[model samples]
Target: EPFSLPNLQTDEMSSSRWPNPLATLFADPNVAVAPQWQNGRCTLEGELLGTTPRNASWLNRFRGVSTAAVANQVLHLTLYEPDGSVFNPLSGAPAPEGFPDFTAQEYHLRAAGKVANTTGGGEIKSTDYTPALGGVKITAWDATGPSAGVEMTGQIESIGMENNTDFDVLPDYNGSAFDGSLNLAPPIVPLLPGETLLRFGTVPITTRRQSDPIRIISCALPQEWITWFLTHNFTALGDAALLRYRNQATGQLLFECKLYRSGFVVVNGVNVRTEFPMSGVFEFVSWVPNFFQLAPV
Candidate 1:
């Protein structure tokens, strides 16, 4: 999928060289195969927090990030299941994680500061599906913008990457750049002449493109709920008891595979929609609290 705007994701990557953050969730025999959760989906909720120099004090600004460049941006919640058969591309690995059985891997439940327009302006209303991001390559300067010159790979949440300014210097990313993520043109490893380099879509690096993930689901909200969201200044929200299920692939929800909350079950005198599982306008899950502290699970 092509990169989107504003709601970009970044992290303080300590080990500059690493694989997918969620790789172990599928490989670790313990976490991947926990009891009771084997066949059941686990629910996780939280906010995909953003900052713009305002309220930067939360991460220990001592004073704080004062500019509110992000005040206009809206919150977007995205859920992804591995897009294809996942395995180490470098290793002739024999299937890493059990899909349907290990349906319990939930990730990225972070809660942090967010700014909104307060007048109920940008919350997403409709729901749709699309392929989520894992990683993508910067084969060449598609026209020097955010200078993301490498295997710009990370987990799905960090999919919101900034692609602005002609040859923009990526922010230190909490000193992430201090490591080696900024090697301009040196190949860390050798590329064989016969190796075919295949990059799918062309990501234009010229515009201040804001990536908007599909607006998934929302519930009917009352005036009080609206007041609470605005009062708390949360563009997006999360919770602690996040539940997840296995094989809920790229463009699918759980029920297609039978993790039925949107099943024959009914509540408050109504049947759950075939697709709508969650109820509130926002989610409930554990949050990391600090933006700089946001890391991979």
Candidate 2:
């Protein structure tokens, strides 16, 4: 998967540091056998949630970052199975029902301001006292089994940054900088030398004179859904029709992957394309009212 243009500075980290602890909780043999997700679904969600910035006010300013400069690279979503398999890599194949693109699914990183709905005063609290900030939520729908769909929420922090910027600094998510070998120290857990955990393809290159390559590294497994909430104005954009990945050992370029938003699913044996409609403001609010307050089950 290629890195988003705006958050380029952040490094793509390996799962060794953030294994999928959630897989352990599921009764499915696949999830249980997987080292990363042996914990439980919610636990895995918690680990990924840890990567997101918790409480901040400044980030709200950058919500819904769709400016031309930031439009190409914006907030997006990725879903992994309960175990740690990449759900479906885009090979230009139409996704099965309930599947998004099976390739890299991109989204617009839009931001919204806080609301003061309390009848009395005190709608806004100091950063220390305030509950964790809230903004966007993402949900995954699968038509199959015990786990139909997965949803996660978080507050948006930094939105539009280049893929190769300094992650420690503002905005960028330098995840790519955590190259499989030297730059990144593999996680403590066992990892195939170059197995990709989570990464961005190179097609939508963010830097100058750059060609896209398939970038992979380990990250928590059993990460069925990934939701990011920006503390400031967030950005969103479309991805190249296709992208690429590489092998860790031979440094061989692996395959090019496609990207999409939402797709179709079967209900009662009927084929129906699922709508990737952007939930309206009211629907969005109603959907994630409890987003910030969600606790691990």
Candidate 3:
């Protein structure tokens, strides 16, 4: 009689569903391969919000503008759901004692009273708000005062720190949700719904490089979705949405990501993971600064 190993049969066990551990090591050759993009084929890479080393150069294009300038400076904001019908408005309250405050806040582009899409490009542009002066700060305005734009806050900080975008601490409190129809004060006019909010500024430099930083206007997400991510670990997964602009001339992509919270952590047997999908840009730099400096602006 031949000795047999447990769970093993000489006739050969059927374990196709449960592949052998050793055989699974390499998996499929295609598994290791990254998605291929032809040299000129363009796909937007990275998040559309926040200040990161990758997105700093792009944000600088809009910096130095005053709030007054941003006011009524027609701008564009894209609400990227791709599959969903309505976009989420940002809102949420601070966590209560232990229950964790859950509320959604919205930022109204009052100064931006009108908007329109680009002639040839899909990107949206505004007619009032001027981000070139001091990029407008969209905060939540509730009874107490203003709350942070649930999604924009995260993106603002991420890119703010990365770029030289000044960071002003958000005051403690909640504001009313931003209504697309509300009329705002100076520097910011009330932006009408369906208007374009972002405009492609001159390319500080010109090149055919695939990794150039892009830019675009920011917008809001759906309410239900905002609540879901906020309650569930602060990481946006299911329908974590965004909006971006692409230069029809250069094919560069710019956008923003906003969320209810930051600081997410995942713990497993031997691994501990943490993340906060606040706001920031997903970008790549392929050319030298000289390329940007010398390129046509």
Candidate 4:
């Protein structure tokens, strides 16, 4: 959960703010949760939508396409049981047919977006209890808009719950960022020749280095997300491989890193209710250096 990149600059920066755009995730669109006999794994799908820039300069940059640079983004999803335990789709445990009895609790289905650099900010709206039929809907839009404002949408879902909490009313997500201490100093190395150095002042030059296989340890994560990570097993050669980081408070871009899943591990036990361990390594795609910027919100 090294959520943000190191700030390499000293001065303040600015980007488009206000009338914040929005991004959303819809859970269990089909409204039915399959039983364990039917694999118990639910398929979730929803849209990621936002509008083109209202400002002339920003509009020029987007060129009216919602899939422009920052428009196309991804968010992590998780599911939980009625007892507040992390739902384990990979576990062989059997589940009852029809929708699970769990009500979508706050932070039950979570996601984040970069509010400043992209059309990816907005508050989640409430749903009419009866019509939704336990379905969850999230819509983001500029709090302030002209007579007619444009919109963009992206879809997300899972075969779990039909109802979820409203983003606007949901408490600030405490579970979004790194849950423990973070260490980010890249390791270093020095080179020397077999031949004897004159007096050996300081080995002439030294090089900064990183671990053979770059590893990242994240705080406890939702069990459902861990299962999804294992299933995808994203690799370096895959076209869709990526790992993005955004500010939890403002939902703005911090770092968008390209990586392939090199390894992963999850720890769990019967007594412990919180703080499950999760770790993994991303084989950094050095060619596409991670994108980092300091933009004002």
Candidate 5:
């Protein structure tokens, strides 16, 4: 009789009956990989609501459970949600279940009536309002008293969302050249046999290249949004106060990033009055490198 190990069978196991550690590791009742894997791609959306020195406290609806400070004078308010499944700002839809409530709202500001000044200024008052869907309406008043009323109303010109032409992700790399001087140096002749030179040596130096700041470029971004940024000092609170990149097909968060605008250029095509395209790049301030992983679908 042959001795046998406990729970160990001597017969060969078929592929269909083979045991898989990964399956067990991931399927444990107490383990959770839901948040780790989500389906579908991601899109950019959010609000820009605040006065000078933009306030981002109202942006929680899109950030989920994360919270970060956005001190920029302008609240850029950009968010990347899974597919069109979540809140689709383009269509003005609410966030889906298990996601933050990203309901858009109105933004408003008013300048109260002021008296005349020595430099030749007269009584003036104005109110500016913007709705989440985009576009601005402004009303102004030139008055001397409650009895005197002269009003002006008009819509601020802006590039509508329908004109957006392009979006892209830009990556950069940085590294130092490998040094081969020591390893490639000729071997000492005294230790070699007659007329023979030794070629053996360790491999040359190596380097671990690193990724530089990442950028997201949007072309034909609404001109009003750009105006908002410049009006607020070229700074805006990032979506959820953080930048994010995702695998469009898997809904997997590829990179959890922090970013700020590095620079931008507003192009007014050959027909300056007809084409007002605002192109800008938001640079990542920092991010984590684990961009791969998907849960069982």
Candidate 6:
């Protein structure tokens, strides 16, 4: 009960499906795992988007450049729905009031955007298998503006899901008609048509390794990776979804908040609860630092 750090990243990685997760955990440093037993995919046809900062002109231009550069200027990441719309999580929540219409979010890059196999008629398949949990964040700032460098906000997993086992499952939002029974169907009341069914796996759970941080990307690296993305589109360079590049250096971390995509979502959850699909774009943001040493242009 005390060894929570190492016990933090466990891997019951083997999926009864295929491509053994059992063997993968031992060989890989990062192995993604899920909470539930049944492995189903949303099979979505959506893209991740955001209006990342381009800086306040002067910042990017040599004329106004200085060590006054920036860091932690708060960036937001977003998941634009298939139709490419955004929902502000801060505005909408099942519990919070004021915003009558806003939805909680979910993020994953496990499925393919193109046709291959599986259900949802080639929309996406969680069975696609992502080996690591990776994401991207972009940031921009005004070297001199409103409060001058810290009045921003916003932003946007992986692994195998076991299909037969589950711990204490909690309904995402606890309320009337809900938390009623483990046998009762969800949406307790349906607003949509018969296209609906007793769906599970919307409410998510997460695990993040806070200490002994791994050397992932920050502003410096994603700036480089986007170079790769700009050319290849969303397809992986050669491997799977979470592509990682290591510049030939041995360095330490000057860290802050971890930029993210949702991790270990319960692609399978049976909450006393149910989550209605908010059919819209999802978004997230993270702040990145302005690299200090710049070459004169």
Best by TM-score: 2
Superposition error at 247 for model 4 (Å): 30
The sequence of per-residue lDDT tens digits that candidate 1 reaches over residues 153-247 is 11212122232121122222212222342222111110222111110111221212357422111111111222232234332222211222223
Task: Assess every candidate by TM-score.
Answer: 0.15, 0.19, 0.16, 0.17, 0.14, 0.17
What is the C-alpha lDDT profile of model 3 across 14-119, one tens digit per residue? 1111111111100011111221110111111222222111221221111111222222323233221222222222322111111101111221222212122111
For model 4, the stretches where C-alpha displacement exceeds 4 angstroms are 1-124, 129-152, 155-269, 274-276, 280-297
Model 5 per-residue lDDT tens digits across residues 1-297: 111111211121100101111111001122111111010111122222111112212111121111121122111112223221223334432222112111112112222223321011111111111122121222222222211221111111111111111111100100112222111112112111111110111111111213422211111112222233334432233321233333434555433322212211111111111211111122233322222221211
lDDT of the structure predicted as candidate 2 = 0.20
Candidate 2 per-residue C-alpha lDDT over 36-93 given as tens digits, one digit per residue, 9 for 90 to 100: 2111111211221222212222111122211111111222223332232333423221
- Per-residue CA lDDT of candidate 6, range 28-120, in tens? 112223122111111111121221112211111111001221235322222221222332333322211110011112212221112232101
Candidate 3 residue runs with Cα over 4 Å from true position: 1-73, 76-84, 88-158, 161-297
- In the order shown, what is each candidate's alpha-carbon RMSD? 22.0, 23.4, 23.8, 22.5, 27.7, 23.6
- Which residue runs does candidate 6 get wrong by more than 4 Å? 1-70, 88-297
TM-score pick, better of 5 and 6: 6
Clashing pairs in 5: 41-83, 41-248, 74-236, 75-237, 76-237
Off by over 4 Å in 5: 1-54, 57-162, 166-292
Candidate 1: residue 270 Cα off by (Å): 60
The total number of steric clashes, by the backbone 3 Å criterion, in model 1 comes to 28
Q: How far is candidate 6 from the true structure (C-alpha RMSD, Å)?
A: 23.6
Error of 1 at 69 (Å): 13
Clashes of 5: 5
Local distance difference test values of all predictions, in order = 0.18, 0.20, 0.19, 0.21, 0.19, 0.19
List, residue by residue over 1-297, the lDDT tens digit for candidate 4.
Answer: 211122211011111111111111111112122111111111111110111122212210111112212211221123233332443434422221112111223111122233423333332222211101212223333322211122232211221122222111211112223111211111111011111100000010111213222211111111232233334433333322244334434555433333212211111121222221111112222322123221211
| Clash count, one per candidate | 28, 67, 81, 24, 5, 32
TM-score of 3: 0.16
